[PDB]
């Protein structure tokens, strides 16, 4: 017909998906450091997914691991462990 006609194909310019920071990584109830990275420093409240940026699956896993650690004695409940205050900040929160 005509060589210049468009050819059916997937978008070659499609950008890779923004995999959540924890995607492809094993969340564990013993990694109290990583679990504390996703709680409020002052109230120990688990941050919502809008703050954490995590996918749904990883947010659910983080929440369950936090609960497991808190109830099994690996993590504090009412506050972030002080030793992990200076850990990298991955939550889009701003109190001050």
């Amino acid at each position: 017909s005509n060589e210049d006609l468009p050819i059916s194909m997937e978008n070659p310019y499609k950008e890779p998906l923004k995999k959540c920071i924890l995607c492809g990584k094993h969340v564990d109830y013993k990694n109290v450091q990583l679990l504390s990275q996703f709680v409020s420093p002052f109230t120990g409240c688990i941050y919502g997914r809008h703050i954490t940026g995590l996918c749904g699956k990883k947010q659910k896993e983080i929440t369950k691991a936090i609960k497991r650690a808190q109830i099994m004695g690996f993590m504090p409940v009412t506050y972030k462990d002080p030793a992990y205050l200076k850990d990298p900040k991955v939550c889009n929160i701003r109190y001050r």
């Binding site: 995999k19 492809g24 109830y29 013993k30 099994m72 004695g73 993590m75 409940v77």
Partner: protein
């Protein structure tokens, strides 16, 4: 199946800690567990003041016992751990490595919900 026993033991001397670990692993084996590994997570201040057997504790030694046991032995092991005084706390969980990292290609975008209302003009 495969379990991990996360154990918080009273912070005590090396002989006492070794005796308690031997007792716990012996109980596991007698109940039928095939202990796979034993890793010590060190002694640290508990996240909160646990009170076991009328005795309050601020520090404890954290240990993990990876093992394979029949499903029926888990309840008996839990009861024995509860009855053991030297154990501040102890929980048998399904070993995390028995879970898989099923692929999650990313955060797929959720398009704005469409056709949620009639196109009636007002």
């Amino acid at each position: 199946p495969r379990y991990e026993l996360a154990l918080i033991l009273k912070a005590m001397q090396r002989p006492e800690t070794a005796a308690t670990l031997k007792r716990t692993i012996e109980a596991l084996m007698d109940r039928g567990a095939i202990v796979r590994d034993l890793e010590n997570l060190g002694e640290r201040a508990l996240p909160y003041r646990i009170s076991a057997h009328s005795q309050q504790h601020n520090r404890g030694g954290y240990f993990l016992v990876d093992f394979y046991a029949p499903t029926a032995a888990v309840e008996s092991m839990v009861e024995h751990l509860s009855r053991d005084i030297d154990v501040i706390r102890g929980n048998i969980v399904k070993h995390p490595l028995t879970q898989e990292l099923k692929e999650c290609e990313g955060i797929v975008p959720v398009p704005l919900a469409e056709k949620l209302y009639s196109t009636k003009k007002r």
